[PDB]
């Protein structure tokens, strides 16, 4: 529940890669696997 209440979606160069600016803002590990990997992120 906690995880689903803090989720980020992204529609559509490398938006899937964990960018450096994600430090302290987005969780590096928590992300769906298979399809929407990197697109769907958690705070």
């Amino acid at each position: 529940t906690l995880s689903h209440l803090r989720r980020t979606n992204t529609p559509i160069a490398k938006p899937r890669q964990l960018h450096n600016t994600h430090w302290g803002l987005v969780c590096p590990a928590e992300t769906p696997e298979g399809q929407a990997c990197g697109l769907v992120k958690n705070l």
């Binding site: 906690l2 995880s3 600016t21 302290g24 803002l25 969780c27 590990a29 928590e30 992300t31 958690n42």
Partner: protein, 138 residues
């Protein structure tokens, strides 16, 4: 009182963040990890705690810095599939499907982040006496 600031990435672009509050002060144990000496001086901000870079599901992982990152990812994706007490009022709610563990237990190896996630109060699993061994081959 001007003790803590709110910094976004755009403003984060122009600051120097200290990883630990002990990196402001100016023979060793071989067991501990090798950490780089602070070659920086003009610090403007200091990190609250490096364990805050993780998320809610990833904060349940014991020693995440001792694992391979995709394994931490897998655990972060499988922690949402574990059974336990999701709500205290589970007996008065009419959910389509709900699973509640018979005897939930707070892990023997916890995280200081679990305190704020209320995981020790509402755990999702049990401490099982595990054995790493080749037995019957099953």
């Amino acid at each position: 009182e001007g003790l803590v600031e709110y910094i976004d990435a755009e403003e984060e672009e122009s600051i120097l963040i200290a990883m630990q509050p002990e990196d402001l002060e100016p023979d060793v144990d071989p067991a501990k990890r090798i950490r780089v000496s602070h070659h920086a001086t003009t610090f403007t901000h200091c990190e609250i705690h490096p364990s805050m870079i993780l998320g809610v599901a990833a904060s349940i992982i014991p020693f995440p810095d001792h694992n391979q990152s995709p394994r931490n990812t897998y655990q972060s994706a499988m922690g949402k599939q574990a059974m336990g007490v999701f709500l205290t009022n589970y007996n008065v709610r009419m959910d389509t499907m709900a699973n509640i563990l018979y005897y939930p237990q707070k892990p023997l190896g916890t995280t200081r982040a679990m305190e704020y996630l209320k995981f020790r109060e509402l755990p999702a699993g049990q401490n099982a006496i595990v054995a790493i061994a080749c037995y019957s081959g099953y």
